[PDB]
Amino acid sequence: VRLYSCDACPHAVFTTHAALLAHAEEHHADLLPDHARLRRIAQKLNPVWNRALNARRNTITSWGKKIFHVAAQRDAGESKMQEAHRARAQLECVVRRWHDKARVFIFGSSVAMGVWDGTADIDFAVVDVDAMERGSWPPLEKNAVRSITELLRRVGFSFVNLEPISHARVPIIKHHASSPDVVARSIRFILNGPATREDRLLLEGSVRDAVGPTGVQQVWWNRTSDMMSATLESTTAAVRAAMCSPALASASLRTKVQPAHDECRPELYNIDFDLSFRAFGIRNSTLLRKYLLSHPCARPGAIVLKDWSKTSGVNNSVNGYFTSYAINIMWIYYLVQKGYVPYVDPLEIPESLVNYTDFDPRYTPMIDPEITNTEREELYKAAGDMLVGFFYFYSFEFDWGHNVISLNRPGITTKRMLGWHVEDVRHPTRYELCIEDPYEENLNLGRHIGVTKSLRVRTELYRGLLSLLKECVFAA
Ligand SMILES: [Cl-]
Ligand SMILES: [Zn+2]
């Protein structure tokens, strides 16, 4: 026996879950206006589910073709992925001036999905692995954010584009790219006075020493010897050169440097990114990647569910709903429980980054370019079946009342196993809809979802189920 409290009025407490749910429909139908109606429609289909699947087989396959089309738009090919690789190397040049042993790791969807569309935000983690192993990483993050912001400003990033967030719970730097080849790999040094011949040789020397023997293609000076331009062999060499620290002979002679062009610039200037100093996101993305590569329909379904979850409002963490990570866990848990992918213990992905190699995320095409028309048709059929099955599983099979969506063990996790069978009751930690975070113990990804919010979520799962049986929440 326990207390249950309403999340939509401050006074309603009950001693049974049934009474709580009844209260939510009876007093708060304005908050969940389609719940009872869509539940009733989907409940008509349940006793005839196999018949429905059979009759709607062509439609379900058509939805699989659409799923693969949406997924294909996220796959911009290996060359586009390599643009993110170059940006990462560019950023690493910059951050090593702050901390020589820091290295830059990409995480997020380019890791989890093995593709990048050239537009999705890139996450960069900056970590000194030796220090992390000693238990001394990150250094004070507010100061790290300010230090790296200044280095970026000095290599040509504008305050228009850079947003230091030194005081968030996790301090980060956000870079917001503006919307609009030799020029892109060229830079300009402006000097505060004229350089002597010795000074010119020293500056050129500094550039050459930064990039190595093949890095410099052309160097030239203006008539007044107060600007030097340089074309480097690549955009990455161009950033490496702009990070040099000249030691000129003439007293008080100083340089400033930026790309030779205001819009045509190295990759790092052109992409949206969040820069952070912690390792946890790397591990999360690597766990997702292992699961999502293990069935050919797993990434396409994950992509369609991310978009669905945002459009339907169930993925909206700022207002207490789920995150994109939570939605991926829902999808993967379904895949594991239904036997579409093998179980992976989150503990199989090391916390330590000592053996890490994939700083640059490995590219895997969304669909095998060599499969046959027949095989492709079979993938469409499977993708549709799997997606309909996800909405059916969460609408009728999964026990939201007593169990937890969890990848931390292969079998069923009950709320009681995690101590989530009772709430401390306001804004309580809620255990209505439970999804266990793989690496943070005792964290419910549904902790802000009280009863009325949970019925909004259930509404959308019924709506998704019904929509995939018909000719839109899934519209681009
Ligand atoms: Cl999110
Ligand atoms: Zn209420």
Curated annotation (Swiss-Prot):
Domain of life assignment: Eukaryota
Binding site for Zn(2+): C6, C9, H23, H28
Localization, UniProt: Mitochondrion
Residue intervals of every C2H2-type zinc finger in the record: 1-32
Residues bound to RNA: R169
Disruption phenotype: RNAi-mediated knockdown at the procyclic stage causes severe growth defect and a severe reduction in mRNA editing. Reduced production of guided RNAs (gRNA) and rRNAs due to a block in the processing of gRNA and rRNA precursors. Accumulation of unprocessed precursors for some pre-edited and never-edited mRNAs.
Residues engaged in binding Mg(2+): D121, D123
PAP-associated domain span: 177-226
Site (Important for catalytic activity): D274
UniProt family annotation: Belongs to the DNA polymerase type-B-like family.
Function as written in the Swiss-Prot or TrEMBL entry: Terminal uridylyltransferase which is involved in the post-transcriptional editing of mitochondrial RNA, a process involving the addition and deletion of uridine (U) nucleotides in the pre-RNA. Specifically, catalyzes the addition of Us to the 3'-hydroxyl group of guided RNA (gRNA), ribosomal RNA (rRNA) and some mRNAs. As part of the mitochondrial 3' processome (MPsome), catalyzes the primary 3' uridylation of gRNA precursors to facilitate their recognition and to induce their processive 3'-5' degradation by DSS1, and the secondary 3' uridylation of mature gRNAs.
Assembly and oligomerization: Oligomer. Component of the mitochondrial 3' processome (MPsome) complex composed at least of terminal uridylyltransferase KRET1/TUT1, 3'-5' exonuclease DSS1, MPSS1, MPSS2 and MPSS3. Within the complex, interacts with DSS1, MPSS1 and MPSS3.
Protein name: Terminal uridylyltransferase 1
Organism placement in taxonomy: Eukaryota, Discoba, Euglenozoa, Kinetoplastea, Metakinetoplastina
